[PDB]
């Protein structure tokens, strides 16, 4: 029944127990034994004796090369940062000091301080501590750009493409633009000497930067060059990153046919080369649930975010920015899923968790807090309208008002006034004011959002059409201007039928809006007409919607890497 | 309901 | 210590009810009901479940016989199949027979039919077959007189393997049922005590080499009896 424990683990439990008398002699052990000892220091709960050994680069750089057991490390590190020890900040400071001490030293020694810099930067970027992986990459870039040889050119290019990711992920897009300009200059200098390096990762990261900035046309163009730059010798992680950014740009560009294949191949490749419980696979699922949510397949989306949050809780502890974004995405997909049913208790918990995390690891004035403050308030308004107590709904509306105004202020501070994300915030706040009996300014908020979306998204986008339907529903039930509501319903229904087939989820809400409007005016023939149309929509939805798990749908894709990129290039 | 979902 | 009395009473009630011996079915209810009044319902909640399991079993076997009757094709089990369903959370006979058993093909048809019936009649109730609580009759027509004896499922597999061939190697017998040898030593000695199977091997002891052959000289005083 009881298998005897191995000699290795018993000696590990003996070295750890005799830890203080042999603390300095552990660092002379093999890196495998070193990681096993420092993991036993975490299993036993000796977090304070581990936060003084992982807090030094003489030890941490000697344990980051445990590539077989790295997820365990991601659990230890995320414990220490949750414990109280600022391991990320102290590791960044130690690396900055080491780089300053090495800058005048020999160039051969300088490169050994870059490979240690790359592994530590990649780890601290994977763990979600971009703000403390930014200093590591800045020191790496400076140390590489002190001299200008070909190897230093390549190292500077790699550090530039890595530093854009840790800058874009921290919502520092303005510095990301300058970082990309520096990368462009460095690659131009490299190409002027006849040496060309693959820039697919750089272009995909720029696509992420612009998609965050909501420059969808430019993001899609850079996606086109990124997919043109894809080769066969690239590492799989770079390919997955490029495909994931390609998918999440093509979805927002409303090209659901190509983005479907892109994201399915991305998920399949992440599952094969990495595993079912890898952080990169978790990110691929988190951006695959985005695609599934934006192609009217809301329900399956919840089955993907929950399959992407559960990977980032097993790997990234409990207080992380990578589990915070998974929480906020699952808090929003469940919010859309249970919009009709009113089952927002789960979607509220997954939104308070993201708020309680980002408010703890990020400052108040951070854009990532704005997105999570949004979703929590959208669940807050949906609970409030279903709430019966007038004081409860009043205070919930006030809390949602505070959350939307804070999110809008943050979005205006970072993005600007005429951006798509700010327009989405305006539309959400207009819906909130409609729920708050402030209709006169609610119509103004909807009009401002519609104008901002039209200035950028045009008349053929679904994002503007959804707020058009929101404003028309405001007009029908609470403004009585039935002509504007009718024309905006017509535009929204036309766009929805053009894009999302014939069984789009909001089409039912639009049809009920038309039915109530036509009942209000008095014409009772078109009431029966659109009642029949609503029944037609219901039967199409019933005979179209099939409950199929997405993970088994992507279980074995018969399409390889070359075929996907070839098909994407052929389509463009 | 009387209004569509989020965006 | 009334708790240890309930545990002791459970083992004998399980043996009394399963083997079919009982002075009267109403007396079991009266004894259970008197303890329920004397020590509370939670004391006899397990015991009451054992009694009601037999009551349901009579009703269930009517339904199972009705189910096999109302079949699209003609299904015949080929034996007088009898089953009692027992709740796993009440009976104390849950001593696990983790030793793997290979039920013979003659009786495989019936057990598969009941699994199909119970899967659709009741949802979510998996069936665990306690093979060492089952007994059945075998038609011993190999000799001159068709002797009738009561043998368990464990004994049935050994006897059925001897129907086609008068002698069966002990190596094949232990691999036909693929279970532990130490249980088989006391399993087959019951047939040795009644001299149902002759000791074909010259070795006095019983081992894997001890191949056995049918006893044609076996005589039974009673036409119908039980092997124990």
């Amino acid at each position: 029944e009881w298998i005897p424990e191995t000699l290795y683990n018993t000696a590990i439990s003996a070295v750890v127990d005799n830890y203080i008398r042999s603390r300095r002699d552990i660092r002379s052990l093999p890196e495998n034994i070193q990681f096993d000892v420092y993991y036993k220091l975490y299993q036993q709960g000796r977090l304070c004796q581990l936060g003084s050994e992982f807090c030094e680069l003489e030890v941490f750089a000697k344990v980051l090369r445990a590539l077989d057991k790295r997820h365990l490390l991601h659990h230890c590190f995320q414990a220490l940062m949750d414990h109280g020890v600022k391991v990320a900040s102290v590791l960044a400071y130690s690396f900055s000091r080491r780089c300053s001490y090495i800058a005048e030293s020999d160039a051969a020694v300088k490169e050994k301080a870059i490979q240690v810099g790359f592994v530590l930067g990649g780890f601290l970027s994977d763990a979600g501590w971009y703000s403390d992986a930014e200093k590591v990459f800045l020191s790496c870039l400076q140390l590489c750009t002190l001299h200008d040889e070909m190897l230093h050119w390549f190292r500077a290019v790699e550090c530039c493409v890595r530093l854009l990711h840790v800058r874009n992920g921290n919502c520092k897009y303005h510095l990301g633009e300058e970082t990309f300009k520096l990368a462009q200059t460095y690659m131009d200098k490299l190409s002027k000497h006849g040496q060309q390096a693959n820039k697919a990762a750089l272009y995909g990261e720029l696509c992420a930067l612009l998609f965050a900035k909501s420059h969808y046309d430019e993001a899609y163009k850079w996606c086109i060059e990124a997919m043109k730059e894809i080769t066969a010798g690239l590492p799989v992680k770079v390919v997955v990153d490029v495909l994931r950014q390609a998918s999440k740009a093509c979805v927002v560009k409303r090209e659901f046919k190509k983005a479907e294949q892109l994201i399915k191949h991305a998920v399949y490749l992440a599952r094969d080369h990495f595993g079912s419980k890898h952080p990169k696979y978790s990110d691929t699922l988190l951006d695959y649930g985005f695609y599934l949510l934006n192609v009217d397949n809301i329900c399956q989306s919840v089955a993907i975010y929950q399959a992407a949050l559960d990977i980032r809780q097993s790997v990234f502890g409990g207080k992380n920015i990578h589990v915070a974004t998974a929480h906020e995405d699952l808090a929003y997909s469940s919010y859309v899923h249970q919009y009709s049913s009113g089952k927002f208790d789960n979607a509220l918990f997954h939104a308070e968790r993201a708020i309680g995390i980002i408010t703890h690891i990020l400052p108040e004035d951070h854009l990532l807090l704005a997105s999570s403050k949004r979703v929590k308030a959208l669940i807050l308004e949906e609970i409030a309208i279903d709430c019966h107590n007038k004081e409860t709904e009043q205070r919930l509306l006030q809390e949602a008002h505070d959350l939307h105004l804070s999110s809008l202020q943050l979005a205006k501070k970072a993005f600007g006034e005429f951006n798509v994300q700010t327009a989405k915030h305006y539309g959400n706040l207009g819906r909130l004011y409609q729920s708050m009996r402030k209709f006169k300014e609610a119509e103004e908020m909807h009009i401002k959002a519609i104008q901002i979306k039209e200035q950028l998204l045009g008349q053929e986008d679904y994002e503007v059409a959804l707020s058009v339907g929101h404003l028309a529903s405001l007009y029908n039930y609470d403004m009585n201007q039935y002509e504007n509501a009718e024309k905006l319903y017509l535009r929204s229904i036309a766009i929805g039928k053009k894009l999302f087939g014939e069984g789009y989820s909001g089409l039912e809400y639009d049809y009920r809006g038309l039915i109530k409007l036509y009942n209000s005016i008095g014409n009772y023939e078109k009431v029966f007409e659109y009642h029949n149309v609503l029944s037609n929509w219901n039967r199409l939805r019933d005979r179209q919607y099939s409950v199929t798990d997405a993970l088994e749908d992507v279980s074995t894709s018969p399409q390889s890497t070359e075929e996907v990129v070839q098909s994407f290039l052929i389509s463009q | 309901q009387k209004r569509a979902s989020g965006q | 210590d009334k708790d240890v009395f309930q545990k002791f009473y459970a083992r004998m009630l399980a043996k009394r009810l399963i083997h079919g011996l009982s002075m009267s079915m109403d007396s079991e209810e009266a004894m259970i009901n008197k303890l329920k009044q004397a020590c509370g319902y939670e004391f006899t909640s397990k015991l009451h479940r054992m009694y009601t399991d037999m009551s349901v079993s009579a009703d269930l076997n009517n339904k199972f016989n009705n189910f096999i009757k109302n079949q699209d094709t003609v299904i015949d089990l080929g034996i007088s199949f009898q089953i009692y369903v027992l709740q796993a959370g009440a009976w104390p006979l849950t001593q696990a027979p983790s030793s793997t058993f290979a039920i013979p093909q003659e009786l495989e048809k019936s057990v598969q039919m009941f699994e199909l019936f119970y899967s659709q009649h009741f949802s979510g109730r998996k069936l665990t077959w306690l093979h060492y609580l089952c007994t059945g009759e075998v038609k011993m027509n190999y000799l001159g007189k068709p002797y009738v004896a009561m043998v368990t499922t464990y004994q049935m597999a050994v006897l059925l393997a001897f129907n086609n061939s008068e002698t069966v190697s002990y190596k094949e017998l232990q691999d036909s049922t693929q279970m532990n040898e130490k249980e088989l030593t006391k399993t087959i000695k019951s047939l040795l005590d009644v001299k149902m199977i002759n000791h074909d091997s010259e070795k006095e002891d019983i081992d894997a080499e001890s191949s056995f052959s049918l006893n044609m000289n076996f005589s039974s005083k009673r036409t119908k009896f039980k092997i124990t």
Binding site: W2, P4, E5, L7, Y8, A11, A14, S22, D25 | - | -
Partner: protein
């Protein structure tokens, strides 16, 4: 049937074949030229493992084979603190 183990200090430790099969690398020791029939039984010499840690490894072998898949609460193997570090590298080298 038996195998003899030599420490780096010249000691000799003789233990059964199945007892020494717990270590992964001892199986590699006895897979190639270490067999040499049964002239002096299977023979293994370590040039880096001292005598005390090899004695503890042999005692661990005895503890492992005796307490393999036991139905009783196994006692903990006593790796004393003064030998814990040396035994840890020995256990990892031997893949015990």
């Amino acid at each position: 049937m038996y195998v003899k183990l030599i420490s780096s200090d010249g000691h000799e430790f003789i233990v059964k074949r199945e007892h020494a099969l717990t270590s992964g690398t001892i199986k590699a020791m006895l897979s190639g030229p270490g067999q040499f029939a049964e002239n002096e039984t299977n023979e293994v010499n370590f040039r880096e493992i001292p005598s005390h840690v090899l004695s503890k490894v042999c005692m661990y072998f005895t503890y492992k084979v005796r307490y393999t898949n036991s139905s009783t609460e196994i006692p903990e193997f006593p790796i004393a603190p003064e030998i814990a570090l040396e035994l840890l590298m020995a256990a990892n080298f031997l893949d015990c």
